Amino acid sequence: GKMFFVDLSRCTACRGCQIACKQWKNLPAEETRNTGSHQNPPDLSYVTLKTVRFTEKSRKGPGIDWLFFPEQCRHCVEPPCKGQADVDLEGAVVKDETTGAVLFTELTAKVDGESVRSACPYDIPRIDPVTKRLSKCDMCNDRVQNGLLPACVKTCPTGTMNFGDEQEMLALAEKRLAEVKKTYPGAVLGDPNDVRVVYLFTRDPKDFYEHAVA
Amino acid sequence: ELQKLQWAKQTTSICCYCAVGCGLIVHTAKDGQGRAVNVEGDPDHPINEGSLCPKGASIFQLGENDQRGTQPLYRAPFSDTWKPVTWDFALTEIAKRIKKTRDASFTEKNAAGDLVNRTEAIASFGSAAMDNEECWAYGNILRSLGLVYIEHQARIXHSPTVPALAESFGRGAMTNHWNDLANSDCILIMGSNAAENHPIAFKWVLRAKDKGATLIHVDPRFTRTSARCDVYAPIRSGADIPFLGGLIKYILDNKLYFTDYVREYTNASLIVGEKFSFKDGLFSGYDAANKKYDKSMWAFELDANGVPKRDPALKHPRCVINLLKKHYERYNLDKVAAITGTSKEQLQQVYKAYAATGKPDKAGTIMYAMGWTQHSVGVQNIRAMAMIQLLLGNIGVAGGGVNALRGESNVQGSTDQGLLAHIWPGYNPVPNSKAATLELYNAATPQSKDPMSVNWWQNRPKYVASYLKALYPDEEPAAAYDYLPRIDAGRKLTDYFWLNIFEKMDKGEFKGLFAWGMNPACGGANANKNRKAMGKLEWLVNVNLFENETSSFWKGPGMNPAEIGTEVFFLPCCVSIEKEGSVANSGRWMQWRYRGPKPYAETKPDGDIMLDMFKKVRELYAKEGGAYPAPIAKLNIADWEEHNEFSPTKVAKLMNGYFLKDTEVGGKQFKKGQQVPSFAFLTADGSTCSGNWLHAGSFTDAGNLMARRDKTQTPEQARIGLFPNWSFCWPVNRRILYNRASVDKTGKPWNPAKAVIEWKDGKWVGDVVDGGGDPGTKHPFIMQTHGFGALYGPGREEGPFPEHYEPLECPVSKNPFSKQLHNPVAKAVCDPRYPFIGTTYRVTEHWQTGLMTRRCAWLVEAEPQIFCEISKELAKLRGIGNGDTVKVSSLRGALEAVAIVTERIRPFKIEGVDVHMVGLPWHYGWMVPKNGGDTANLLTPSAGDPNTGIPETKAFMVDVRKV
Ligand SMILES: Nc1nc2c(c(=O)[nH]1)N[C@H]1C(S)=C(S)[C@@H](COP(=O)(O)OP(=O)(O)OC[C@H]3O[C@@H](n4cnc5c(=O)[nH]c(N)nc54)[C@H](O)[C@@H]3O)O[C@H]1N2
Ligand SMILES: Nc1nc2c(c(=O)[nH]1)N[C@H]1C(S)=C(S)[C@@H](COP(=O)(O)OP(=O)(O)OC[C@H]3O[C@@H](n4cnc5c(=O)[nH]c(N)nc54)[C@H](O)[C@@H]3O)O[C@H]1N2
Ligand code: SF4
Ligand code: SF4
Ligand code: SF4
Ligand code: SF4
Ligand SMILES: [S]
Ligand SMILES: [W+6]
């Protein structure tokens, strides 16, 4: 299988990833407004598979710790969401055995969408209020199968986004965690054994987002 | 295969936004015969390696955008509606306006009876967005027609700084390049928000940190840049010179300068004349009536041969280095800390990290962009940066340099092609009315009697003559010299510049404006004034991608179209990915890009618009005569076109240049029609043409070097990332300027592990050497008259050393460093109803006035509306909740915005009072989207600096009220 290593100690919140995901899939733009933040869209939705979350945390002396979290489906090794969906119709959620990708098919209109989202420990799935389809990050599985990096990974300028074979990535994450600790000594890997999207957080994952970790 | 890409033709392009110059791959349907289906990063491009920020990443949505213009539109005087019109109509009628305005306004000779051959009744804005061949062609068309009022973006952000670099090093340009940042040991980002404004640069900045570098952000605001630096140091607006002067005193006090470099390569050892003095904030030669200096009082003491005297022991009290120590001893830690608002501990931390790079085998770089350098002492801010870098030996080295980040993708190129009033292409001055002959124009270049001083500008007669041959190949250059317009030797140069074009417009003194690839109704300070002033034009020609606040100023807020007489032609141009040509990035990399999709609808590339337009004017002169026809009739536009269309390729070859006969030069035989291989082989006798001497070496008999996509590198090239076989940079592919300074007088690098050049077996290896010659036989700064890096800079209007003069008028009354509060060489009202310092800046997701990005749904989705950023303290004081609507007002205008209350903004402490800074983006405009807001330039003043002629967009007084 394949793994993302997401080094958030390198993120500039350029939102290249957010725009790239929509360009590759030709997704529509939400209606948004500023409600006191750079963050927009405020949330994942049917047509938004990745949003960069912004959090300001007070620190001693000048400036802040400004925490950026580009949110996507973690492509869990043992997907809760499938287990929930395989109760209404085994088929709506499958696992590509090549890539590791957890994929929502057209059959998700038949299952209880509401229920699949609640099963997700990362609150990832989103429902089309028309077609009742469940939508989320599909790992750009077409591109991966064709030996291309996912759009969000190729676009990232900082070296935050990394993709590859689960072995090389876990290797890289351990070696990167050691280096990053020298600057952010409270840095940790998010649920590195359960997921295919391993975030390096610079501190308490929960400071980046309520569902940053399970 | 991926179905989306399977049947599409793949071409390469270069991002149309910022001057990083990221590579694209464009997929086009029907094997190139239809529309774009995908745009993403070019994985092979060595600057971005496939990555794009959201601006480049959204170029598909910019290009395939059904809000784009489709055909010319016409707005009759007092009409309240566009009528769609043919290209034929638009261009023939525009050619008639130009002819009528020119025939009626042309002046052979001014008051003083001097030949000027010009029209002052037509002005042109734009553009850094056009391809280099379009910029060159555009300038030559406007000058053939007799224009002098020719300006673009560069005036606003780079013009106030370039002369700092020219004085210090001999050239105006960024000294290194993006990839080189990875080689730095300490990166000081000061007057730049590069993580948002040059986002792919942070690939190389964070790579420098991987290798051990400390990253320092010095900014009044905590930004996305700040979040990823080791050190964030807040500085109050305008306290940059105190900060940098304190760093100079720290370097000299602690003896952290690179001694051998300083002795050999800088003017540290030059003896300044006994007439040089400084006291209480005034240098010698001050004329208090005219607020102006006699700079002759700053002259060097010259030897018997006319060469500045040197004491290599550095003992003489009038040695530059000794006068330098004396000048900066006033910038102690306590004084600097108090004015900057930066803690003494944080100043010490930043000084010690950065000055550690004075070590020969360590390199420091400084990145600045626009910052707050717009004001009258911005040039002196950049002088202090240059002088610090020279003291530490960081000029000419890998990971070193002054990286003056360019803004727009081709603002480097547009400047190089002379789309500013004071320069022809290749930085040859526009003649003034006293330059009666070419011989006399050429007489003004200073000479050096120092044999070690290359003084390269002595070659200027070759460039000017080779230039006049590319415009007027059948005339003698001396004769051609008389076709091109001249400015008044009597007038202040700034009378021909951006801010005074608006001032003149508002007085009805212009009949015609070209708004070519610019949006002045949002870009100009005091938009209220400029929008009204655009009413006082007979005709406006706007060439742009979309209908906008400039094309449609006549139906903007508070305007009644009936009252407004200005006739408007809107000419829709094609996007970057729908045309071929070159753009010159910040690093001077001139990069070729190709057409992917054919032009949308009836849009045209700028080249075809401008060529066809000029052809109509020329045919009109050739039928009905009119004012001084020769410059128009004789211009060689034939070398510009191929199969009836503008040819980027042929124009680029003309820009590089070719021999008009068999010729011997540098003892080599050259056949007529051969491409000039380098500016080293141009002639002043008319043997050679070159549209731009800097471009000599760019397109040779070997072919188009700008279109090279070769990652081939020797090990010493790859160790520092030169990529010399990837495109082409001026001059002659010298990737790091001043690189002779990177080695001792035997040709051995100061830092072997990051050599730039190295003398090995009779030859310079690595970069192309910046100036030919054996080690230790030439001074390293070959464009300098004297050949040294200038610590002491006696050509600057404000004085030879940077001195703090307060650029914030309103909240400051005392200068800690002298009795002199403001720049003694430069009328803010400071009305107390406006107590807050307003400032404008950028976000990553929007571009300039937002004319392009406000049409892009994904970018509006991330940043939908104008906002106002304020501290919790100012939030507390004005009763403003996060996300509340606020009214921001000034003497000039008012607008509504969403409050962002953030700890990232802090109050300033100025003479024991809290002063609140309020932050706005200037990416918004009344045209689009719905609820976006209007330009922050409703708030800004159009009062600028008598000497820079640049407006004030970074510190202007406002009030902010909850609504
Ligand atoms: N995303 C994006 N990138 C752009 C552009 C764009 O519109 N959007 N425009 C491009 C253009 S044309 C240009 S010229 C460049 C400009 O690039 P930048 O100069 O980086 O742009 P700004 O954000 O205007 O200003 C930079 C920073 O200067 C800080 N600053 C303000 N006053 C002072 C001061 O007194 N001292 C110091 N040290 N800092 C101060 C501001 O707080 C801000 O963080 O960016 C280019 N890149
Ligand atoms: N308050 C405030 N005002 C500022 C600034 C600030 O910091 N604060 N920044 C200043 C600076 S640095 C600058 S550079 C100016 C910029 O001001 P402008 O250049 O007027 O701004 P835009 O027009 O938004 O810049 C991009 C333009 O390029 C055009 N374009 C794109 N591609 C092409 C093409 O192929 N051909 C043609 N003809 N046009 C094309 C787009 O349509 C768009 O009009 O604004 C200045 N104004
Ligand atoms: S992996 Fe693909 S689908 Fe998932 S967030 Fe990235 S670009 Fe979007
Ligand atoms: S993160 Fe949620 S939606 Fe994605 S695989 Fe896990 S359980 Fe499923
Ligand atoms: S592209 Fe990379 S640096 Fe930019 S927001 Fe996404 S993950 Fe962060
Ligand atoms: S805007 Fe600048 S950094 Fe962003 S993709 Fe374009 S060239 Fe690269
Ligand atoms: S610019
Ligand atoms: W600019």
PDB file of N, CA and C and ligand atoms in Angstrom, chain B residues 153 157-158 370 407-408 842 848, ligand 8:
ATOM      1  N   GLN B 153       4.305  48.977 -13.612  1.00  0.00           N
ATOM      2  CA  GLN B 153       4.327  48.517 -12.212  1.00  0.00           C
ATOM      3  C   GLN B 153       5.640  48.879 -11.521  1.00  0.00           C
ATOM      4  N   UNK B 157       7.046  49.730  -7.006  1.00  0.00           N
ATOM      5  CA  UNK B 157       7.663  48.866  -6.024  1.00  0.00           C
ATOM      6  C   UNK B 157       9.175  48.760  -6.207  1.00  0.00           C
ATOM      7  N   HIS B 158       9.718  48.792  -7.414  1.00  0.00           N
ATOM      8  CA  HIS B 158      11.141  48.515  -7.548  1.00  0.00           C
ATOM      9  C   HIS B 158      11.963  49.784  -7.770  1.00  0.00           C
ATOM     10  N   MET B 370       8.644  44.567  -1.567  1.00  0.00           N
ATOM     11  CA  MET B 370       8.198  45.978  -1.558  1.00  0.00           C
ATOM     12  C   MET B 370       8.290  46.491  -0.111  1.00  0.00           C
ATOM     13  N   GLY B 407       8.297  41.511  -8.171  1.00  0.00           N
ATOM     14  CA  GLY B 407       6.863  41.239  -7.965  1.00  0.00           C
ATOM     15  C   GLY B 407       6.253  40.385  -9.072  1.00  0.00           C
ATOM     16  N   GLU B 408       5.978  40.992 -10.231  1.00  0.00           N
ATOM     17  CA  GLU B 408       5.183  40.387 -11.327  1.00  0.00           C
ATOM     18  C   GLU B 408       6.136  39.506 -12.134  1.00  0.00           C
ATOM     19  N   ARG B 842      -0.691  41.889   0.915  1.00  0.00           N
ATOM     20  CA  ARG B 842      -1.200  40.821   0.030  1.00  0.00           C
ATOM     21  C   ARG B 842      -1.525  39.608   0.890  1.00  0.00           C
ATOM     22  N   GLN B 848      -2.557  41.090  -7.011  1.00  0.00           N
ATOM     23  CA  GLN B 848      -2.590  42.541  -7.290  1.00  0.00           C
ATOM     24  C   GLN B 848      -3.945  43.092  -6.882  1.00  0.00           C
TER      25      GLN B 848
HETATM   26  W     W C   8       4.801  45.140  -7.760  1.00  0.00           W
END
